[PDB]
Design a protein around this motif. Structure first.
Motif, PDB file in Angstrom:
ATOM      1  N   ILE A 113      -3.555   2.585  -8.562  1.00 22.02           N
ATOM      2  CA  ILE A 113      -3.413   1.135  -8.470  1.00 22.02           C
ATOM      3  C   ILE A 113      -3.659   0.725  -7.026  1.00 22.02           C
ATOM      4  N   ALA A 114      -4.644  -0.139  -6.812  1.00 22.71           N
ATOM      5  CA  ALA A 114      -4.967  -0.661  -5.494  1.00 22.71           C
ATOM      6  C   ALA A 114      -4.592  -2.134  -5.409  1.00 22.71           C
ATOM      7  N   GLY A 115      -4.553  -2.647  -4.186  1.00 24.90           N
ATOM      8  CA  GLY A 115      -4.286  -4.062  -4.009  1.00 24.90           C
ATOM      9  C   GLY A 115      -4.084  -4.423  -2.554  1.00 24.90           C
ATOM     10  N   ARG A 116      -4.109  -5.730  -2.306  1.00 29.50           N
ATOM     11  CA  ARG A 116      -3.893  -6.288  -0.982  1.00 29.50           C
ATOM     12  C   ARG A 116      -2.415  -6.188  -0.600  1.00 29.50           C
ATOM     13  N   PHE A 117      -2.122  -6.485   0.665  1.00 32.75           N
ATOM     14  CA  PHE A 117      -0.757  -6.401   1.166  1.00 32.75           C
ATOM     15  C   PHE A 117      -0.655  -7.181   2.471  1.00 32.75           C
ATOM     16  N   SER A 118       0.470  -7.871   2.661  1.00 36.68           N
ATOM     17  CA  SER A 118       0.704  -8.680   3.850  1.00 36.68           C
ATOM     18  C   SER A 118       2.118  -8.454   4.368  1.00 36.68           C
ATOM     19  N   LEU A 119       2.296  -8.663   5.673  1.00 33.57           N
ATOM     20  CA  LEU A 119       3.578  -8.438   6.327  1.00 33.57           C
ATOM     21  C   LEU A 119       3.562  -9.121   7.690  1.00 33.57           C
ATOM     22  N   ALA A 169       1.630   2.861 -24.893  1.00 32.34           N
ATOM     23  CA  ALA A 169       0.715   1.997 -24.149  1.00 32.34           C
ATOM     24  C   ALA A 169       1.483   0.796 -23.613  1.00 32.34           C
ATOM     25  N   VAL A 170       1.565   0.682 -22.288  1.00 32.92           N
ATOM     26  CA  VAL A 170       2.145  -0.480 -21.625  1.00 32.92           C
ATOM     27  C   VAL A 170       1.241  -0.884 -20.470  1.00 32.92           C
ATOM     28  N   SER A 171       0.849  -2.154 -20.440  1.00 34.12           N
ATOM     29  CA  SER A 171       0.158  -2.706 -19.286  1.00 34.12           C
ATOM     30  C   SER A 171       1.167  -3.087 -18.212  1.00 34.12           C
ATOM     31  N   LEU A 172       0.690  -3.161 -16.974  1.00 31.51           N
ATOM     32  CA  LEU A 172       1.548  -3.448 -15.837  1.00 31.51           C
ATOM     33  C   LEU A 172       1.064  -4.704 -15.128  1.00 31.51           C
ATOM     34  N   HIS A 173       2.011  -5.460 -14.582  1.00 33.29           N
ATOM     35  CA  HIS A 173       1.685  -6.654 -13.814  1.00 33.29           C
ATOM     36  C   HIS A 173       2.724  -6.816 -12.716  1.00 33.29           C
ATOM     37  N   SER A 174       2.286  -6.707 -11.466  1.00 30.44           N
ATOM     38  CA  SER A 174       3.195  -6.799 -10.334  1.00 30.44           C
ATOM     39  C   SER A 174       3.594  -8.243 -10.074  1.00 30.44           C
ATOM     40  N   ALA A 175       4.897  -8.466  -9.911  1.00 27.59           N
ATOM     41  CA  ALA A 175       5.406  -9.791  -9.563  1.00 27.59           C
ATOM     42  C   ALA A 175       6.698  -9.592  -8.776  1.00 27.59           C
ATOM     43  N   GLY A 176       6.590  -9.605  -7.450  1.00 28.68           N
ATOM     44  CA  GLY A 176       7.755  -9.459  -6.600  1.00 28.68           C
ATOM     45  C   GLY A 176       7.728  -8.222  -5.727  1.00 28.68           C
ATOM     46  N   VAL A 177       8.026  -8.395  -4.442  1.00 25.57           N
ATOM     47  CA  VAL A 177       8.082  -7.299  -3.482  1.00 25.57           C
ATOM     48  C   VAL A 177       9.305  -7.495  -2.600  1.00 25.57           C
ATOM     49  N   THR A 178       9.998  -6.401  -2.296  1.00 24.45           N
ATOM     50  CA  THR A 178      11.204  -6.468  -1.481  1.00 24.45           C
ATOM     51  C   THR A 178      11.375  -5.145  -0.747  1.00 24.45           C
ATOM     52  N   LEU A 179      12.523  -4.999  -0.093  1.00 28.96           N
ATOM     53  CA  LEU A 179      12.795  -3.893   0.811  1.00 28.96           C
ATOM     54  C   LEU A 179      13.939  -3.032   0.286  1.00 28.96           C
ATOM     55  N   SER A 180      13.902  -1.747   0.630  1.00 27.76           N
ATOM     56  CA  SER A 180      14.948  -0.809   0.238  1.00 27.76           C
ATOM     57  C   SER A 180      14.889   0.407   1.153  1.00 27.76           C
ATOM     58  N   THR A 181      15.617   1.451   0.762  1.00 27.79           N
ATOM     59  CA  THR A 181      15.666   2.719   1.475  1.00 27.79           C
ATOM     60  C   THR A 181      15.358   3.849   0.499  1.00 27.79           C
ATOM     61  N   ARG A 189       9.829  -2.162  -1.847  1.00 29.49           N
ATOM     62  CA  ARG A 189       9.935  -2.022  -3.291  1.00 29.49           C
ATOM     63  C   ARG A 189       8.898  -2.887  -3.991  1.00 29.49           C
ATOM     64  N   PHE A 190       8.474  -2.444  -5.172  1.00 25.06           N
ATOM     65  CA  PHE A 190       7.534  -3.178  -6.008  1.00 25.06           C
ATOM     66  C   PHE A 190       8.075  -3.248  -7.428  1.00 25.06           C
ATOM     67  N   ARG A 191       8.152  -4.460  -7.971  1.00 27.45           N
ATOM     68  CA  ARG A 191       8.638  -4.691  -9.322  1.00 27.45           C
ATOM     69  C   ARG A 191       7.501  -5.217 -10.185  1.00 27.45           C
ATOM     70  N   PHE A 192       7.504  -4.827 -11.457  1.00 25.51           N
ATOM     71  CA  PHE A 192       6.389  -5.090 -12.354  1.00 25.51           C
ATOM     72  C   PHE A 192       6.886  -5.664 -13.671  1.00 25.51           C
ATOM     73  N   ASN A 203      -0.760  -8.502  -3.213  1.00 24.03           N
ATOM     74  CA  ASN A 203      -1.615  -8.648  -4.379  1.00 24.03           C
ATOM     75  C   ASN A 203      -1.978  -7.260  -4.883  1.00 24.03           C
ATOM     76  N   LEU A 204      -1.810  -7.036  -6.184  1.00 22.80           N
ATOM     77  CA  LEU A 204      -2.065  -5.728  -6.766  1.00 22.80           C
ATOM     78  C   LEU A 204      -2.889  -5.881  -8.034  1.00 22.80           C
ATOM     79  N   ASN A 205      -3.616  -4.821  -8.366  1.00 23.98           N
ATOM     80  CA  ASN A 205      -4.371  -4.764  -9.605  1.00 23.98           C
ATOM     81  C   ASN A 205      -3.507  -4.191 -10.723  1.00 23.98           C
ATOM     82  N   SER A 206      -3.736  -4.685 -11.933  1.00 20.91           N
ATOM     83  CA  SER A 206      -3.031  -4.186 -13.100  1.00 20.91           C
ATOM     84  C   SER A 206      -3.553  -2.805 -13.477  1.00 20.91           C
TER      85      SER A 206
END
Lengths: 49, 547, 49, 97, 49, 48
Positions: free
Chosen positions: B235-241, B172-184, B196-199, B145-148
């Motif tokens: 940008i702050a937000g929650r995180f789970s794993l 001016a562009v607002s951001l909205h996080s939707a989707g998290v995955t893995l990379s190198t 990774r975080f996609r917005f 979970n992330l803040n815009s």
């Protein structure tokens, strides 16, 4: 059965959308055309001497 | 039961193509395993870069304004501890705008000018130092979970030999996080994984114009100055794993980290087969028969896999795409071809075959060619060939009575759920082998108005009456052309066991009828009560399925 | 742009249909009957081609 | 090139369900069982949809996505793995009846 | 009647994951999008002093 | 038309159900009856 296989061929349409969006995402560029006016005024510059 | 499982997982092999093309285009250029909770609160700092290139000459033409992946760092203080981070940015799906001033060399022109609108994405990665960041090589699920952020844009100006300079302001562009995955990620030959975080995007009301130019009311953040002279983006937000660890046998010793992937285990084939023989040696008595009735669809086949990669279905259908290398898909393809082209050639193809009773492909095409063994009779050969072909086929089309692939997939499931050492990438060979290597030789039966016979792929065959049991001399052609166009009974119980069971323990009529027709009802009701000799027969038969 | 043609790819089927008819004139008589009995599925029809 | 589009909301699901029941309570009878014999497909189950605004493909995908997390899917999965384990070996000798 | 409807709504779980994976990876590798200047020439008095 | 040939008392209740390929195959294979002409025109009847 052969007729049942035919209906099966009719059923599985939920893959054509995936196929053509795969085609689109790997396809060429997109574009956005713009807007144009209509008639005009036909002006000029009369008092020149 | 499992016959249909094999059918519709084979039919759903047309979907391998989409997966194959997308994978190609995306890379162009008991348990013995325990999980750890991991919920670490996080926040992130951003940064954007740019690239500007002019054209040689009088300094009037400008070539490209573009974004560029950048990477910064910052020092974090959370929970009373200190941690350092490396982050990188990127962007895809950018819209291209342009402005031509003309052709004569004294006017302003910019060819490429990228601006972000509601079709692009931004990509972010982390570099933590806590042990949570070290356990990201084997993860079950991921959520965050992330803040815009109400990001904005700055202002850039050019410089020309004459006249006041052109300016370019706003973004001016607002951001909205939707989707998290893995990379190198790597910057200094320090290649190790990250997440990774996609917005998604949204733009705001301010106007982003160009001075003294026939251009105004541009909506979208350009690539001129995306930072306003600032430093970062909070940008702050929650995180789970919920990642896991390859824990040992004991319970007192967890592991503080995870070492690596692509480890050279790849344990040798053949040494992953004897343990299946043991498992079959301690499998069951009759509950597998209960299992051999419910058709276990694709969802139920892989419901309790408990893996980390969801591409198991694509490979598990690539396997019955790939029996091209075995003799299952090849056999069905060849015999469908033979039936198809034998249905159009009256000139030559209708006369080049052997003889049964009439011109049929299910009987005489079986007797095509095969080098003969040391010492056998004749009729054994034709019976073996026809039985093998109608075995390979009639199983995969339809039948009546409980069939052998049902118990085949029954032992498959009993091995899979009770495996205790199988990777998600070793089943796409076990399924193939078990589909082929099991069921070595089974006999088949058909009823005909109180006259019944049987044969199998061993070179053996008999014939006998229904309401009594004695052998009658065998014939070929009428029996072949009556098995051509009839549903067949997969002989679960062979003739010798039937004779012995009738001789010793007796049998009633209803039991005879519902046993000769492969009804699992009487089979289970009979093996449950007191386990007579056919319990030994079925235990041998389930022992028979070796690999 | 180009004044897009209102017909596409018909000039192949227009000649292919008659040879379909010519070849279908001489289908067998008993083998196609049991060719219908096996439920030739989506994979089987499109495999041996 | 506006400020942005704005998706609209919808009322809470309770009124939807109650009016859905209120609509159910005036269904026909004989044509219901007349329809209840034809086994259709997964396809015609969603052939007639309203206004189809770039939604049919996405709506079908979303139905498939949301259907596997239902109670029925969990119940069938526990059915199948429970029976597979019961037939796998002598796992539970005698704990309760 | 419904048997196969609820069977098919349940089996295609093997395809929904493919769908979400392909949509995401396509979002990753999307190409550029270029607008068109339009059927007009925008000019102005550039070298003012 | 075929009733001139007998084919009765087990073939009527099956061929009248019009669904079993067994009896029609057995007729077509050796008898060469009117039904051969019927299905031959049927095969021709789907020209395209």
């Amino acid at each position: 059965m052969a007729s049942l296989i035919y209906r099966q061929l009719l059923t599985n349409s939920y893959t054509v959308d995936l196929s053509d969006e795969i085609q689109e995402i790997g396809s060429t560029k997109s574009q956005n055309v713009t807007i144009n006016p209509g008639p005009f005024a036909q002006t000029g510059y009369a008092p020149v001497n | 039961m499992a016959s249909l499982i094999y059918r519709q997982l084979l039919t759903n092999s047309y979907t391998v193509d989409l997966s194959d093309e997308i994978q190609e285009i995306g890379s162009t250029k008991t348990s013995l395993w325990k999980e750890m909770q991991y919920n670490r609160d996080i926040t992130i700092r951003f940064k954007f870069a740019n690239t500007i290139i002019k054209s040689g000459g009088l300094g009037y033409k400008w070539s490209e304004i573009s974004f560029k992946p950048a990477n910064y760092q910052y020092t974090y203080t959370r929970d009373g501890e200190e941690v350092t981070a490396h982050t990188t940015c990127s962007v895809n799906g950018v819209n291209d705008f342009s402005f031509n001033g003309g052709s004569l060399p004294t006017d302003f022109v910019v060819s490429k000018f990228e601006v972000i609108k509601e079709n692009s994405y931004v990509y972010i990665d982390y570099w933590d130092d806590s042990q949570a960041f070290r356990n990201v090589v084997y993860v079950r699920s991921l959520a965050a979970n992330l803040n815009s952020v109400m990001c904005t844009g700055g202002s850039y100006n050019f410089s020309l030999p004459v006249g006041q300079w052109p300016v370019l302001t706003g973004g001016a562009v607002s951001l909205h996080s939707a989707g998290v995955t893995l990379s190198t990620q790597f910057t200094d030959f320090v290649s190790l994984n990250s997440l990774r975080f996609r917005f998604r995007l949204a733009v705001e009301e301010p106007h982003f114009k160009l001075t003294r130019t026939r251009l105004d009311r541009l909506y979208g953040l350009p690539a001129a100055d995306p930072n306003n002279g600032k430093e970062y983006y909070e940008i702050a937000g929650r995180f789970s794993l919920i990642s896991l660890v390859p824990s040992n046998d004991d319970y007192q010793t967890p592991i503080a980290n995870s070492v690596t992937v692509r480890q050279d285990l790849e344990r040798q084939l053949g040494e992953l087969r004897e343990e299946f023989n043991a498992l079959s040696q301690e499998i069951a008595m009759s509950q597998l028969i209960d299992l051999a009735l419910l058709p276990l669809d694709m969802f139920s086949m892989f419901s309790g896999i408990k893996s980390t990669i969801d591409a198991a279905k694509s490979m598990a259908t690539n396997v019955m795409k790939k029996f091209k290398k075995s003799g299952l898909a090849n056999s069905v393809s060849t015999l469908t071809d033979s039936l198809s082209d034998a249905a159009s050639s009256i000139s030559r193809g209708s006369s080049i075959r052997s003889i049964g009773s009439s011109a049929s492909a299910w009987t005489d095409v079986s007797t095509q060619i095969t080098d003969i063994s040391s010492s056998v009779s004749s009729v054994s050969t034709q019976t073996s060939t026809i039985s093998r072909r109608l075995r390979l086929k009639e199983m995969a089309t339809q039948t009546e009575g409980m069939n052998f692939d049902d118990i085949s997939a029954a032992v498959l499931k009993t091995k899979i759920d009770k495996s205790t050492q199988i990777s998600p990438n070793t089943i796409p060979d076990i399924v193939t082998e078990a589909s082929e290597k099991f069921i070595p030789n089974r006999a088949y039966r058909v009823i005909n108005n109180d006259d019944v016979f049987e044969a199998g792929i061993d070179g053996k065959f008999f014939a006998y009456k229904v309401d009594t049991f004695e052998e009658i001399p065998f014939d070929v052609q009428k029996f072949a052309d009556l098995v051509t166009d009839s549903p067949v009974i997969s002989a679960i119980i062979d003739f010798k066991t039937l004779k012995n069971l009738n001789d010793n323990y007796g049998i009633t009529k209803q039991q005879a009828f519902n046993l000769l027709r492969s009804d699992p009802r009487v089979l289970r009701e009979f093996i449950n009560q007191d386990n007579p000799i056919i319990r030994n027969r079925i235990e041998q038969l389930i022992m028979q399925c070796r690999l």
